């Protein structure tokens, strides 16, 4: 298995560059490697893995939020469009689930000027086609999402005025959302990772009357008591951050911490509460997706 990173946003070497790159982690050699980059620039786009392809869904290419969707065949190092969904979006949150992509939630500014969403929308890759499905209970754009017993967590996220800790639950079999236990900390451009049962939340960004504030910190979901407990922080905040699991372990990879777009990447082993520093990716990441394969 490979940890790929895909598009992302930086300054360097070009001031305000939105990133059609790729890179792949290679966990045996501790190395990073490009391979075929999108056909657009997409910073703050979803990714999902099934049938053995990378979907790039959605993000901004620098000018216009994106409903275009793209796959990646690790076996031919090619993309290949499919069918765009129905809504733009950025800041999308992206699911695997029963067999169908779900884009949650995201920002756009095309049809009804600016707007942070609480639209759901489902691929079926069997007929290329998106549906949409029940909406959440608020907006959520820089949403983080986890699968786990059948259902798709919406976690954080900004609601257009607010940095959010709500979580709620989608369940396909009955199309509804149901609320659960909110995070301690609210978080938006929050990463998401599902590892031994639990859900973390992975650094992130909120508001205070101090300030405004990159997070370092992460947090644990226990589905079986609906509570949320904190586990030992980062080395560095990460807002706009990637997260993958392999091999019992979560990796945060890129983001920005109100200073500087990250290359850098960590891993967090459950089992010893600790991070541990990883090579590098090539190319500085903020607003990545982060895919498994």
């Not at 990173?5 to 990073?32: I, K, M, Q, R």
């Not at 990378?54 to 065949?73: C, K, P, Q």
């Not at 777009?261 to 010893?272: F, G, Q, W």
Request: aromatic share 8%; glycine share 12%.
């Amino acid at each position: 298995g490979l940890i790929y990173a895909v598009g992302g946003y930086n300054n360097s070497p070009d001031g305000h560059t939105h990133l059609s790159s790729l890179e792949a982690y290679n966990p045996s050699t501790d190395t990073w490697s490009p391979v075929a980059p999108m056909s657009v620039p997409r910073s703050g786009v979803g990714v999902a893995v099934i049938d053995g392809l990378i979907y790039a869904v959605g993000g901004y290419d620098g000018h216009t939020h994106l409903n275009s969707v793209e796959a990646y065949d690790p076996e031919t190092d090619e993309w290949s469009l499919v069918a765009p969904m129905t809504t733009r979006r950025s800041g999308v949150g992206v699911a695997v689930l029963g067999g169908l992509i779900y884009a949650v939630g995201g920002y756009n500014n095309s049809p009804d000027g600016h707007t942070h969403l609480s639209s759901l929308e489902a691929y079926n890759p069997s007929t290329d086609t998106w549906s949409p499905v029940a909406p959440m209970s608020v907006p959520r754009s820089g949403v983080g999402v986890a699968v786990i017993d059948g259902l798709i967590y919406a976690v954080g996220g900004y609601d257009g005025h607010t940095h959010l800790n709500s979580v709620e639950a989608y369940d396909p079999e009955t199309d509804e959302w149901s609320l659960v236990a909110p995070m301690t900390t609210r978080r938006s451009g929050v990463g998401v990772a599902v590892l031994g049962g639990l859900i973390y939340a992975v650094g992130g960004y909120n508001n205070s009357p101090d300030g405004h504030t990159h997070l370092s910190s992460l947090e644990a979901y226990n589905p079986s008591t609906d509570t949320w407990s904190p586990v030992a922080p980062m080395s560095v905040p990460r807002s706009g951050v990637g997260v993958a699991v392999i091999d019992g372990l979560i990796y945060a990879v890129g983001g920005y911490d109100g200073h500087t777009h990250l290359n850098s990447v960590e891993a967090y082993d459950p089992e010893t509460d600790e991070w541990s520093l990883v090579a590098p990716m090539t190319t500085r990441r903020s607003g990545v997706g982060v895919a498994v394969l």
